[PDB]
Amino acid sequence: MEALEELMKLLNMKDFPYRIEGIDISHLYTVASLVVFEDGFPKKGDYRRYKIDDYESIRTVVKRRYSKHPLPNLLFVDGGIGQVNAAIEALKEIGKDCPVVGLATVVFENREIHLPHDHPVLRLLVQIRDETHRFAVSY
Predict the structure, then answer these.
(1) Contacts of 65 by beta carbon, 8 Å cutoff, 6+ apart
(2) What binding partners and quaternary form does the record give?
């Protein structure tokens, strides 16, 4: 089986995670770095950095971006529950619905899901996090 299908099932997603966006907030101005995976592959032409209090930063970027662009099927936030929940609140505040996941163990729906190290979904989420971080650290 494919990791994307397994991710869909783990998170009980309504939609297949065809487009995943990943966001990291870093401090050196605050910069939000955003990566894009399409069908599991990075799409570097679609990467973004926003120049702009990590919760306020996430809120601003989420609202700036999704007032101009379609939601992904899944948003990954390189952070734990506080950042994940900041993104969820920001989306709700503008009347938009998209699942948000992070890593604390997966952070999802105000809960944590511990996965075995080699679980394919954990491995995929780590890959997304690592690409998010690679892009951020490069600025």
Answers:
(1) 34, 48, 50
(2) Interacts with UvrB in an incision complex.
